[PDB]
Amino acid sequence: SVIDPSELTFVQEIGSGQFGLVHLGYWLNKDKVAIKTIREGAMSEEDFIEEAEVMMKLSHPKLVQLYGVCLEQAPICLVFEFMEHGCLSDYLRTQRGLFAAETLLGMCLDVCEGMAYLEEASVIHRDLAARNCLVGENQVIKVSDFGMTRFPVKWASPEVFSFSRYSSKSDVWSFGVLMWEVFSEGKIPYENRSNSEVVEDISTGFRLYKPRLASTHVYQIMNHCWKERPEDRPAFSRLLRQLAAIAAS
Numbered sequence: 001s002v003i004d005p006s007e008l009t010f011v012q013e014i015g016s017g018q019f020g021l022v023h024l025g026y027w028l029n030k031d032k033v034a035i036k037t038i039r040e041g042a043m044s045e046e047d048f049i050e051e052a053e054v055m056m057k058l059s060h061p062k063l064v065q066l067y068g069v070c071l072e073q074a075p076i077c078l079v080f081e082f083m084e085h086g087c088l089s090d091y092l093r094t095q096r097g098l099f100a101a102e103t104l105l106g107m108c109l110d111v112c113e114g115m116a117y118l119e120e121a122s123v124i125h126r127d128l129a130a131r132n133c134l135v136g137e138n139q140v141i142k143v144s145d146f147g148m149t150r151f152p153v154k155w156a157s158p159e160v161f162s163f164s165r166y167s168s169k170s171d172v173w174s175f176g177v178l179m180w181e182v183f184s185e186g187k188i189p190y191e192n193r194s195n196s197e198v199v200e201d202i203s204t205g206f207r208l209y210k211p212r213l214a215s216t217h218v219y220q221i222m223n224h225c226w227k228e229r230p231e232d233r234p235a236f237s238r239l240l241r242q243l244a245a246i247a248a249s
C-alpha cells in the first residue's frame with residue numbers, strides 16, 4: 001500500500017485542476033504515473049491506509065487504478081495510473097464534431113462496465129460525472145473518484161438532493177447525466193439553471209433534452225436512469241447488456 005518517496009520522481013504539473021494538484025511522475029523507473037498531492041490531516045494514517053488498501057483491491061480495467069500512497073514525507077500523495085488523454089470533459093469539449101455516435105456509445109459502455117463492477121462489490125460512487133472520468137490508451141474511458149473522496153445537484157437523483165439517500169441506483173441517475181454529457185460532446189447539464197430551479201424542474205417531470213447524436217433508443221435508456229424512484233431505474237448490470245445490445249442491434 002505505502003510507497004517509499006525515494007521511489008518517486010515528480011516531473012511537471014498536468015491537468016486543468018478538476019482533480020487538484022497532479023504531477024506526471026515516474027515510479028521505480030520508468031513507469032509513468034499521475035501523482036496527486038493531498039492535505040496533511042484529513043483522515044488519520046490508519047483509516048487512510050486501510051482505505052488505500054480497499055481502493056487498490058477494486059481492480060478493473062475500466063477503473064483508474066490506485067498504485068499506492070506516499071506518506072513518509074510531506075506533502076503526502078496518491079500514486080495513480082497515468083491516463084494518456086486527460087479528463088473526459090475536456091477530451092469531449094475540445095474535439096466537438098469529431099466523434100461518431102458509435103464512438104460516444106462505446107464511451108458509455110466503458111463507464112457502465114466500471115460502474116457494474118463497483119455495483120457488484122457494493123461500492124457506491126456518489127459523484128459520478130464526466131469530470132471524474134479519464135481517457136486512456138486507445139481512447140478507453142475509465143472511472144475515477146470512487147475512493148479517497150475526502151454539492152453537485154445537477155448529477156444527484158431526487159432522493160440524494162432531498163435526503164442524501166445514496167445507492168447504486170442513485171449512481172444510475174448520475175450515469176444518465178454522464179451519458180447526456182458524452183452524447184452532447186461535453187455540454188454542461190442544466191447550464192443556466194440555479195440549484196433550486198434544477199430541483200423544482202426535476203420534481204415537475206422535466207428531463208434533459210435529447211442530444212442530436214443520441215438516437216431515440218439511447219435517449220430512452222437515458223430516461224430510464226432518470227426515473228423518479230430508484231426502484232424503477234435499471235441496475236448497471238442490466239444497463240451493460242442493454243447498451244452493448246443496442247450497439248449491436
Ligand SMILES: C[C@@]12Cc3[nH]nc(C(=O)Nc4cnn([C@H](c5ccccc5)[C@H]5CCCCS5(=O)=O)c4)c3C[C@@H]1C2(F)F
Nearest residue numbers: 014015019022034035036080081082083084085086087144
Ligand atoms: C485520478 C487521477 C489519475 C490520473 N491519471 N492521469 C491523469 C491525468 O491528468 N492525465 C493527463 C493530463 N494531461 N494529460 C496529457 C499529457 C500530459 C503530459 C504528458 C503526456 C500527456 C495531456 C496532453 C496534452 C493535451 C491534453 S491531455 O491529453 O490532457 C494526461 C490523472 C488525474 C487524476 C489523478 F492523478 F488524481
